[PDB]
Amino acid sequence: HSWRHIRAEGLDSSYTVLFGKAEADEIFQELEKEVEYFTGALARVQVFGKWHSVPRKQATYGDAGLTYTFSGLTLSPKPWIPVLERIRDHVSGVTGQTFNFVLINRYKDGSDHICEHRDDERELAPGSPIASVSFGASRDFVFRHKDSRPSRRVAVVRLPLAHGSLLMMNHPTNTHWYHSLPVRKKVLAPRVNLTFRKILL
DNA sequence: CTGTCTCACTGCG
DNA sequence: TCGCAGTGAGACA
Numbered sequence: 061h062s063w064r065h066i067r068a069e070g071l072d073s074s075y076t077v078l079f080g081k082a083e084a085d086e087i088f089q090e091l092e093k094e095v096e097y098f099t100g101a102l103a104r105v106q107v108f109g110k111w112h113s114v115p116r117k118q119a120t121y122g123d124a125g126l127t128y129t130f131s132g133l134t135l136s137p138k139p140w141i142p143v144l145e146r147i148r149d150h151v152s153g154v155t156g157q158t159f160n161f162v163l164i165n166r167y168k169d170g171s172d173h174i175c176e177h178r179d180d181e182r183e184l185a186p187g188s189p190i191a192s193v194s195f196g197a198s199r200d201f202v203f204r205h206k207d208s209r210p211s212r213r214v215a216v217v218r219l220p221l222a223h224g225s226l227l228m229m230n231h232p233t234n235t236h237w238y239h240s241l242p243v244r245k246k247v248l249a250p251r252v253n254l255t256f257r258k259i260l261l
Numbered sequence: 262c263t264g265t266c267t268c269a270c271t272g273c274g
Numbered sequence: 275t276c277g278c279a280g281t282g283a284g285a286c287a
């Protein structure tokens with residue numbers, strides 16, 4: 061109910077803290093114990109003509125039959141597990157939005173990262189928001205306008221994403237802005253991030 | 262003078 | 275330690 065609003069041209073996002081420390085810690089410990097991450101062939105992506113192992117771990121859970129493809133990699137959902145349904149249900153309650161798929165990214169420390177991109181794949185429902193819930197170490201998240209990488213002097217938006225927090229990325233954020241989690245060498249602890257999405261069957 | 266796009270890396274500064 | 279430029283091998287429209 062108290063949201064920090066993050067707005068610029070084409071940028072509509074909202075940030076809030078959902079869980080206090082003790083609850084967040086408990087959810088984190090459960091995610092650590094319960095989440096199974098893809099390995100090997102399901103952990104390699106193709107970008108700029110080259111194949112790379114992803115510098116983090118990824119997992120996908122969601123309703124049966126759906127798929128999510130990005131960067132030459134196709135991920136299939138594992139069935140929902142209790143800790144994930146709990147988070148999904150809490151997020152639906154607070155936002156009034158629904159989700160049928162989640163991508164989980166785990167950054168073991170500040171050297172694990174994710175390069176900039178847009179979540180704009182064809183199989184995301186038009187106009188649907190992405191809910192980004194974070195546990196573990198706080199890490200800086202960066203929004204960058206697509207015509208500044210240059211054409212326009214539009215400033216980056218930076219914010220720390222804290223333990224137990226929710227970042228709502230609403231349309232049209234993903235049409236107009238790239239996001240990333242840059243390397244932060246001083247961060248030593250892991251971070252687990254869940255991005256709940258609505259996927260087209 | 263003039264196509265768009267890249268969930269990743271190295272090579273700088 | 276951080277952030278930026280240029281990819282790179284295509285696949286498009």
